[PDB]
Design a protein around this ligand. Structure first.
Ligand SMILES: *[C@@H]1O[C@H](CO[C@@H]2O[C@@H](C)[C@@H](O)[C@@H](O)[C@@H]2O)[C@@H](O[C@@H]2O[C@H](CO)[C@@H](O[C@@H]3O[C@H](CO)[C@@H](O)[C@H](O)[C@@H]3O)[C@H](O)[C@H]2NC(C)=O)[C@H](O)[C@H]1NC(C)=O
Ligand SMILES: *[C@@H]1O[C@H](CO)[C@@H](O)[C@H](O)[C@H]1NC(C)=O
Length: 119
């Protein structure tokens, strides 16, 4: 999936600018499909759309996982010094991977814990 895989960037601030300029481009399609699935679950019948919403959430999560992982791997040492609040905040938001940092078994346990809690 081209949306799932980010591009090739450098470690400089201009590379970070290209990074943050492609992030919105991917976010357009992925967030659009996510909001469309949520709308279908909400504005229409709840049946035959819950699995659509679930798969949309899964693909959005994979998008964020890959893009944030690349963000961290490239700009962990230079995340602080950027001399511009906009891209600094963009990199700060993308860097935070949430629960994605956990290994496979730990992440599965965490998600199943959340599901059991809500249920
Ligand atoms: C909570 O979730 C479990 C599944 O477990 C999930 O993964 C774990 C690694 C933890 O992170 C959990 O928090 C996480 O939710 C639901 O599945 C239930 O699991 C049990 C244990 O495996 C199943 O077997 C039971 O085991 C013993 C005997 O071996 C007896 O208690 C029962 O007779 C039963 O066999 C159980 O069938 C299974 N239930 C399902 C699949 O419906 C669990 O329902 C859910 N809620 C609670 C209250 O635990
Ligand atoms: C960017 O770097 C990655 C590092 O694995 C490499 O695989 C990829 O081909 C590079 N992209 C381009 C367009 O050269």
């Amino acid at each position: 999936d081209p949306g799932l895989q980010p591009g090739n960037f450098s470690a400089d601030e201009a590379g970070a600018q290209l990074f943050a300029q492609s992030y919105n481009s991917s976010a357009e399609q992925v967030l659009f499909q996510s909001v469309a699935a949520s709308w279908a679950h909400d504005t229409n019948i709840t049946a035959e759309n819950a699995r659509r919403q679930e798969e949309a959430a899964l693909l959005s999560q994979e998008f964020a996982e890959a893009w944030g992982q690349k963000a961290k791997e490239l700009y962990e040492p230079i995340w602080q010094n950027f001399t511009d609040p906009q891209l600094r905040r963009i990199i700060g938001a993308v860097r935070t991977l949430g629960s994605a940092n956990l290994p496979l078994a730990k992440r599965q346990q965490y998600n199943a814990l959340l599901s059991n809690m809500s249920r």
